[PDB]
């Protein structure tokens, strides 16, 4: 990154960290800092079952670390054609910097395009906690009729899910329960369509094909609308 963005990051650090400038004083120019290995982009034998591949993909995502610096290192324009987002995903693997939820979704797509028997679709959440709204996103996946997820979160139970849920409803209800355990109220769920496995596709990701108002729908219509989206995807 350029001089200007670099100084912007450290200026931001000074305002949000309590010790402020002393963090920058310790780190900037320090000579014996840990060398961070560049995480190895996972590659897969054809004998390896898809669920085991998903474990390796998620391990790679986790190795990059959640970005707590306050500065996003990759700009993600969500309307960009898939081929452009996949160029960005490659750049993410080469620069190997910390990431947040949306970056992990793009990486998850990039690293599973080699899995045509796996369907991938974004799942975004809108939640409410302590008078404020929060947004989060994961990459929902479907293998052999079971649902799981890839992603990046501050919390362990708001990202990776092995593909073992029998319905999309059960997957989303598991996220809702995890949010409840962190005292968030789940307000909306936005579900995208399946993403092409062609990394040179020029079509856009459809992020918000279904928008579910959890509170207005109620338990049974919530599940029914989730079942409808799953049907929409099997086309």
């Amino acid at each position: 990154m350029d001089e200007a963005t670099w100084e912007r990051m450290w200026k931001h650090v000074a305002k949000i960290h309590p010790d402020g400038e002393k963090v920058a004083q310790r780190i900037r120019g320090a000579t014996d800092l840990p060398k961070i290995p560049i995480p190895s982009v996972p590659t897969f034998q054809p004998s390896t079952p898809v669920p085991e591949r998903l474990e390796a993909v998620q391990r790679y995502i986790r190795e990059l670390q959640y970005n707590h610096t306050g500065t996003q290192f990759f700009e993600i324009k969500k309307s960009r054609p898939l081929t452009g987002l996949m160029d960005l995903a490659k750049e993410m693997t080469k620069e190997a910097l910390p990431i947040k939820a949306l970056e992990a979704v793009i990486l998850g797509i990039y690293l599973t395009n080699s899995m045509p028997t796996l369907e991938r679709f974004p799942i975004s959440f809108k939640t409410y906690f302590s008078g404020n709204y929060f947004r989060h996103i994961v990459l929902g996946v479907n293998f052999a009729g079971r649902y799981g997820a890839l992603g990046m979160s501050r919390r362990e139970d708001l990202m990776y899910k092995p593909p073992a849920f029998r319905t999309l409803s059960e997957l989303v209800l598991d996220f809702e329960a995890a949010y409840g355990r962190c005292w968030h109220v789940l307000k909306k769920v936005k579900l995208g369509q399946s993403v092409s496995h062609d990394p040179h596709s020029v079509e856009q990701i459809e992020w918000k094909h279904s928008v579910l108002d959890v509170e207005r729908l109620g338990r049974d219509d919530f599940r029914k609308e989730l079942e409808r989206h799953a049907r929409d995807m099997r086309l």
Binding site: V23, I27, Q65
Partner: peptide, 24 residues
């Protein structure tokens, strides 16, 4: 090469910062 060196120095400082911010 000066470019790669600059990016590697930045990356090492980014991760050192990320640990500090994670611990906070």
């Amino acid at each position: 090469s000066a470019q790669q060196e600059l990016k590697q120095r930045q990356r090492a400082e980014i991760y050192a910062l990320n640990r500090v911010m994670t611990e906070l």
